[PDB]
Design a protein around this ligand. Structure first.
Ligand SMILES: CC(=O)N[C@@H]1[C@@H](O)[C@H](O)[C@@H](CO)O[C@@H]1O
Ligand SMILES: CC(=O)N[C@@H]1[C@@H](O)[C@H](O)[C@@H](CO)O[C@@H]1O
Ligand SMILES: CC(=O)N[C@@H]1[C@@H](O)[C@H](O)[C@@H](CO)O[C@@H]1O
Ligand SMILES: CC(=O)N[C@@H]1[C@@H](O)[C@H](O)[C@@H](CO)O[C@@H]1O
Ligand SMILES: CC(=O)N[C@@H]1[C@@H](O)[C@H](O)[C@@H](CO)O[C@@H]1O
Lengths: 47, 47, 47, 47, 47
């Protein structure tokens, strides 16, 4: 329901591990931005 | 209570997760600076 | 299972500590990429 | 009594949370450098 | 044993906290590199 890791790449992409899955995307623009709903799934487990 | 994550973007802005919410702001320069009060709330839950 | 540390170097390489071993590699861009099966093992224990 | 967070800004300034307080300074130069004694206190609580 | 923190400075140098002491060094490029044995001790305790 939260993140295990949450961190930036050098180009300013936000990375996060949520429910053992790896996600990336531009950081949220405002508090109504549903970041997890639009982040790119780049890893399907094991993180 | 405290922060679960506290980290920089490569652009120099400080980010923090506090009570499952996501905040960003220029880092504080003195302890007279209540950072959490002037930080931009960019995530209302789920972090 | 999963990582204990997961973080970028400033040149864009992803690093991870997994089962006390250190791994590095380009970050995944697809969840078809089994990152840990192709990451370079750079530390065999003690991490 | 140790740090809870310890991390770099993009210009190379070290940040640390110690006893719920936020500190910053140039990173320690050597083991004779008492970093915590010379670091700037930039946050007096809540970290 | 192991690391409490393990992170990069923006100049590419790897930092690690091991048994309350702070180390820095160029990151390992193979698992034959005993990183901790060659790392520079930059803090003798309190991390
Ligand atoms: C930690 C790691 O490398 N996890 C990957 C996962 O991201 C990926 O989706 C899957 C594809 O089969 O392989 C591995 O499980
Ligand atoms: C992890 C994540 O994406 N959290 C967001 C939250 O920050 C945002 O306030 C909310 C608005 O709909 O959507 C999601 O819950
Ligand atoms: C924390 C650390 O420096 N670990 C290294 C390990 O990565 C490496 O495989 C081994 C080489 O013999 O030496 C050390 O144990
Ligand atoms: C988490 C946070 O923003 N803490 C700050 C603290 O650093 C600062 O010294 C104080 C000033 O009144 O305000 C807040 O408590
Ligand atoms: C957290 C911190 O600043 N630790 C330092 C330690 O690294 C250093 O070796 C010593 C020098 O006397 O002073 C402090 O204990």
């Amino acid at each position: 329901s939260g993140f295990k890791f949450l961190f930036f790449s050098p180009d300013g992409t936000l990375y996060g591990v949520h429910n053992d899955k790896l996600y990336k995307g531009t950081p949220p623009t405002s508090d109504k931005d549903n970041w997890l709903a639009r982040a790119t799934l780049i890893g399907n487990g094991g993180w």
